Amino acid sequence: APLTQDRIVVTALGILDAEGLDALSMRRLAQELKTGHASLYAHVGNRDELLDLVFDIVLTEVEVPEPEPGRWAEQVKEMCRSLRRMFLAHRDLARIAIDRVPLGPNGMVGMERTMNLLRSGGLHDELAAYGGDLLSTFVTAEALEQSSRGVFADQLHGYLKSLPATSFPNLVHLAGPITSLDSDRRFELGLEIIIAGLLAGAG
Amino acid sequence: MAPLTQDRIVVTALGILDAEGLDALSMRRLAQELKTGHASLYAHVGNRDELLDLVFDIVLTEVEVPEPEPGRWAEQVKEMCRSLRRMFLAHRDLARIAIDRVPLGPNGMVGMERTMNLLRSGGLHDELAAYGGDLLSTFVTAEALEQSSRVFADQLHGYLKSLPATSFPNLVHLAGPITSLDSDRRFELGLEIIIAGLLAGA
Ligand SMILES: CC1=C2C(=O)c3c(O)cccc3C=C2C[C@@H](CC(=O)O)O1
Ligand SMILES: CC1=C2C(=O)c3c(O)cccc3C=C2C[C@@H](CC(=O)O)O1
Ligand SMILES: CC1=C2C(=O)c3c(O)cccc3C=C2C[C@@H](CC(=O)O)O1
């Protein structure tokens, strides 16, 4: 004994890290916990519900600095890199998250902290409220593409290079970047773009 | 009956999509609708996965990428995005389909060519132009998805608003903005942020 929600969640996360999402069935989980379905459902509900809890549990891995003046740009980037670290350390997690609710204790307080750091930058509400949404969406998407990946890049990269340079001039000349941009490079590139935009729209 | 063509196949599939949604689109359902055998259907379009690439590419014709007019770069970029957004909103389950798919194709590639042309015409260096295009279309697709997904806002707004203001000042103060910002308001904010940043990087 005995089944707790937190104990169920750590177990489901344990097997997600090891063997990935599709190997996370309620049956497998129930099997690991050596318990009956009934007790499992009562605690975490169904699989969507379980994922939700798993998503929230790993959010503690994300660190949101307290705002230092002079340092907003860099601090927001820290937060974002922290979120990406979480995604990279957890198989299939970005897949769990890009759909679902940070509406849970850990996500709720992480929001508060995130909103605090954003507003401190002189962003205004709509801008702060949305910016946080934008950054989160950005990081999650970039992380989904990362874990997604090979040679596709290479077959695609070459496919574009072969284009009739007379009709598809830009494509041939941009074939490289389009296809095979360093993951870290894309992240940092997108990070700067969004951050500069937020500042531009603050003042 | 007239000999099956790829385009008639694909138009019909889009019709089922639009009316009935992604999950009602099967090769069996499409065969029914077309009154043809599974061989001639497959001959033309392959499996469901391939069918979807074709459906996606055919709708891209609805998107308009202006030829660069000097003076108006920033606004023409927003124009292109609004048009791409329009297409998603006009088409059910589409943003979902686009989420794992390379536009590449007749219009797909043509519109990328035209997009990179607009981007670089703004003084964006190869790498900003290329990524900016990716970031821009990823942003539009994600907003579309979101918009389609959608009382809940009032429930969430109620919860955030009724929080201990001493514990969650920001979540209580930003209760509304967070809960719901029309899809239009979100979209434009997101556009101006990204376009301003592309300009800063250039
Ligand atoms: C859940 C959570 C966070 C977030 O959800 C988060 C985010 O969604 C987007 C961008 C940044 C963050 C940061 C955090 C930090 C985290 C801290 C905690 O709950 O202990 O709490
Ligand atoms: C391929 C294509 C387009 C695009 O791909 C596109 C885009 O990717 C992002 C934002 C806007 C657009 C617009 C178009 C328009 C269209 C080009 C054409 O075939 O005429 O078809
Ligand atoms: C969602 C997505 C893309 C697109 O959807 C896209 C598009 O819809 C029309 C024209 C071009 C594109 C390009 C992309 C690139 C990529 C972005 C990402 O997943 O980060 O994955």
UniProtKB/TrEMBL annotation, chain A:
Q: Looking at the keywords, is Cell cycle present?
A: no
| Top-level taxonomic group | Bacteria
Where in this chain does the record put each HTH tetR-type domain? Answer: 2-62
Q: Can you tell me which residues the record assigns to a coiled coil?
A: none
Mind listing the UniProt keywords for this protein, alphabetically?
DNA-binding, Repressor, Transcription, Transcription regulation
Residues the UniProt record assigns to the DNA-binding region sit at: 25-44
Example of a GO MF term: DNA-binding transcription factor activity
Q: Might you name a Gene Ontology BP term for this protein?
A: negative regulation of DNA-templated transcription
What is the protein's name according to its record?
Answer: ActII protein
Q: What is the lineage of its organism?
A: Bacteria, Bacillati, Actinomycetota, Actinomycetes, Kitasatosporales
What gene, per UniProt, encodes this protein? actII
User: What fragment of the full-length protein is this?
Assistant: 30 to 242 of 259
Automatic annotation (TrEMBL), chain B:
Coiled-coil intervals in this record? none
The primary gene name is actII
Q: What is this protein called?
A: ActII protein
Which keywords label this protein? DNA-binding, Repressor, Transcription, Transcription regulation
Start-end of DNA-binding region: 26-45
Molecular function GO labels: DNA-binding transcription factor activity; transcription cis-regulatory region binding
Q: Does the keyword Hydrolase apply?
A: no
What processes in GO biological process is this protein linked to? negative regulation of DNA-templated transcription; response to antibiotic
Whole sequence portion shown = 30 to 241 of 259
